[PDB]
Amino acid sequence: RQAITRAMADQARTIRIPVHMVEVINKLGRIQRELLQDLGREPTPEELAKEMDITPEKVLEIQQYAREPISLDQTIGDEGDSQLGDFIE
DNA sequence: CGCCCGCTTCGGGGCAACCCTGCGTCTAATACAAATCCGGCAATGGAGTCAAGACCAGGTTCG
């Protein structure tokens, strides 16, 4: 389980993210899931920073780092002839 | 007169090329070492700056 989790931390993302940032991102996701099931709504980021013993700007930095990239090979418009990369100035 | 045996003819199978009847959350850390950022003095040394101050040369004024 150690080697499988380490390989999932290494190779499962497009841009590479180190192990401790992956750990705190998964911690943030688990705590947000628990607070969503408990409170019933989406938690405030200051409440998340209160829960995770860190600062809300660090919470915002982690939420910025967690954003996976989107692909350029889908169809934006109704017709499939228009790919996504043909509307980027 | 009947009989084998490959040659051609069609069937069926098999396969290659395109769409949606397609389109999940997961142990959890510690310990340590190396690399790197960065913050703050601590030597500068060269490059810019102010000011004096001298250098005549030819208009300009005066004799």
Curated annotation (Swiss-Prot):
Subcellular location: Cytoplasm
Leader sequence residues: none
Residues forming coiled coils: none
Recorded superkingdom: Bacteria
Region (Sigma-70 factor domain-3): 23-89
Assembly description: Interacts transiently with the RNA polymerase catalytic core formed by RpoA, RpoB, RpoC and RpoZ (2 alpha, 1 beta, 1 beta' and 1 omega subunit) to form the RNA polymerase holoenzyme that can initiate transcription.
UniProt remark on domains: The sigma-70 factor domain-2 mediates sequence-specific interaction with the -10 element in promoter DNA, and plays an important role in melting the double-stranded DNA and the formation of the transcription bubble. The sigma-70 factor domain-2 mediates interaction with the RNA polymerase subunits RpoB and RpoC.
Its biological purpose: Sigma factors are initiation factors that promote the attachment of RNA polymerase to specific initiation sites and are then released. This sigma factor is the primary sigma factor during exponential growth.
Family: Belongs to the sigma-70 factor family. RpoD/SigA subfamily.
Protein name: RNA polymerase sigma factor SigA
Parent-record interval covered: 352 to 440 of 528
